[PDB]
Target: ABC type periplasmic sugar-binding protein
Amino acid sequence: EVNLRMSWWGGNGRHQVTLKALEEFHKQHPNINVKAEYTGWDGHLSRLTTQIAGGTEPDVMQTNWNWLPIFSKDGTGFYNLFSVKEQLDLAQFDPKELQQTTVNGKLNGIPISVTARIFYFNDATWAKAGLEYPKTWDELLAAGKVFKEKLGDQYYPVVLEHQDTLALIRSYMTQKYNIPTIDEANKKFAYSPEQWVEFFTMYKTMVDNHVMPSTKYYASFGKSNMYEMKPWINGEWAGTYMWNSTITKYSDNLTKPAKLVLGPYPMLPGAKDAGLFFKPAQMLSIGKSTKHPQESAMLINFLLNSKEGVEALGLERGVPLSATAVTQLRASGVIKDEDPSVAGLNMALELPHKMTTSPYFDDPQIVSLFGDAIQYIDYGQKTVQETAEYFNKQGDRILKRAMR
Ligand SMILES: O=C(O)[C@H]1O[C@H](O[C@@H]2[C@H](O)[C@@H](O)[C@@H](O[C@@H]3[C@H](O)[C@@H](O)[C@@H](O)O[C@@H]3C(=O)O)O[C@@H]2C(=O)O)[C@H](O)[C@@H](O)[C@H]1O
Model:
């Protein structure tokens, strides 16, 4: 008898397929039981952090790429998957993708899929507005006035949570200036004080121009998951800047026959880089101190490589990196080039994207600080100037703690 625990996050579609994969795995291995621990994204890292701090984390965990510095600065924070290569077919995964999940020579997770935030739009609402999807940053900014006037005050081209906004304005700044956002060598942000003023001024411009809800307006609804909010469901918030790897969590909640459709990616004339936040979407990792590394490795291999596991899991985590899995799903007609998640990935790959985001750009305290910052602007407690200086100062402080 081997008892394993596995955690993951996601929407209920992902919960469904994962649970069904676990029953097959157990059917194939009567001596191995897996206790499933799953939630939505909200608070998931917080809960795992508490487990790891106390040494009680699961045997198998779905993990995020920005968590590697948080838990595994020296690469020993998760079990070294090179040590279980007998059970786990590593050759299915591109070596450059494995490099992204390797730390000090130790393989900390198997990357499941890749992803980038891109624009997806509610086709029903945009048709009502009579507008085509923005092809430029100018058209995005201009869409807000059209939505507000043609459809009504409650209508917005997109909705953006603060993390989405942080990535979006970074993309714009990368297009303009072609420099990394984080200066990893000097453990600090790379932007001049002027560029930070520009960053927050763009936010203010977008809010003023009715592109997306302000934080104050968003709060007036304001606590469920974004994809479960009424103005999302009914099409009033007509788009999202979101991972292709989890786009059905969003599209599944729209009101038929509305669909989420892939939009253009705005590119500044003369930009050398799109400034995508492009990364491994998520990983499967093994607990550092698991008493069952081999059985844990068997479970990962089953989910990511086995015919039954791949079939069960389908596309709920995006387009598989595993060569056998992605071939299988194309062959079964599950992967369709016209599907917004697949099309979104293909568009992103063709965009010039040589700049790779630092994992510290997605440090959760940096992301939280950003939310506080824009809230200061929207609630009239700091000017754009004061907010920029505050973000630069407090962010550099967080980065120093994060990168120690
Ligand atoms: O495919 C995935 O599950 C995805 O998970 C991570 O992204 C999380 C979250 O799961 C995403 O839905 C998205 O979350 C939304 C907002 O962007 C976020 O700021 C927060 O408000 O919650 C929203 C939500 O719950 O849907 O973005 C999240 C994030 O980027 O942290 C991984 O990061 C991602 O790569 C992928 O595995």
In short: The first helix runs from residue 12 to 28.
